């Protein structure tokens, strides 16, 4: 209540840098804050919109809701037994510093997820992943507040129903509010060097026997080189999920498009590079007034300054239609659209 803010600009709180207003904005620092905000949204008859760092979020209009910013803090080692180490972070912790924190303690598991923006609390929503690692690979459990009952529930790995950019919380939106997250990491050496550029850079810098810290630094360097920093150019990273198609459609697509970029899955279905499909549409480097497509990262929609969220969405809708027509493939956006 001391930090509660009315008719307040959300621009500092979304990486896209869209300027719309929140009816109320609350900065929750603990569970007691979260319950006060829930209760107040009830008192006022308002929806509640939860945000972390607003790095996977597209705001398209004034938010007639209580916006609840998760600013809880807290990082600890729960349990440290026989090289297996279980760690806990409060939802409001910044993801990348939590990763550096883990690595500096000699824990391996998160290095591939270095430098991803946002918070710990949002990380399970889309099962964050990069460089062949996903949160689910190290996920032990979380504690979530049931917004139907006001009761707490613990979610173990299976219960979250993790998938590619997916979870129970994305499927049943607006129900669970994640308070904290427990991950199981290791003290023994682990390297997931699946993606060639990581492997390649490590060899160029002459590290034949790398540690999880070396990988993290390499990953940070590649990411810095190639991803637009939101500070320069507002964005929410990859705007679309990579679609999965069956071998039927995959065969038919390949005949029509031999240069097609795809990764066949253990199930045998094919994951297409969304970026390739979009590039083939000619969208790369496109710009219409304040919105555009980045010139090297075809998945990244950008704000050159002053974009409305509606303009961003109109652009994404044009790209989706172009890809449906060209390839018969549906692209799903990744950022949550309000
Ligand atoms: C430059 C850049 C690079 C990125 N790279 C990656 C990447 O490599 N991999 C990747 O997976 N993502 C990436 N992202 C996307 C984003 O950083 C992650 O998905 C991140 O987890 C979102 O966290 P956030 O706290 O900003 O969530 P927000 O954007 O604040 O919100 C995310 C969704 O979760 C909900 N939500 C947030 N917090 C909670 C909570 N505590 N409880 C319940 N619901 C909640 C929100 O309502 C919203 O629906 C990138 C984004 C940017 C800008
Ligand atoms: N979600 C986001 O907002 C966001 C933003 C920036 C970067 N990233 C992630 O960071 C990594 C680097 O991103 P990037 O855009 O530069 O893509 P990249 O590394 O240039 O790879 C391009 C595309 O090919 C896939 N790919 C590449 N090597 C692969 C392999 N060995 N096995 C399976 N698939 C492979 C990636 O899928 P995946 O994306 O399925 O890994 C991605 O769709 C990727 O994992 C990407 O997801 C995500
Ligand atoms: K994204």
Numbering used by the authors: 2 to 339
Verbatim from the authors:
The resulting UDP-N-acetylglucosamine enolpyruvate (UNAGEP) is reduced by the UNAGEP reductase, MurB, to generate UNAM. All MurB proteins known to date are monomeric flavoenzymes that bind strongly a stoichiometric amount of flavin adenine dinucleotide (FAD). The catalytic cycle can be divided into two half reactions and follows the scheme of a ping-pong bi bi mechanism. Here, we present the crystal structure of NADP+-bound PaMurB, which establishes the co-localization of the NADPH and UNAGEP binding sites and supports a ping pong reaction mechanism with sequential substrate binding.
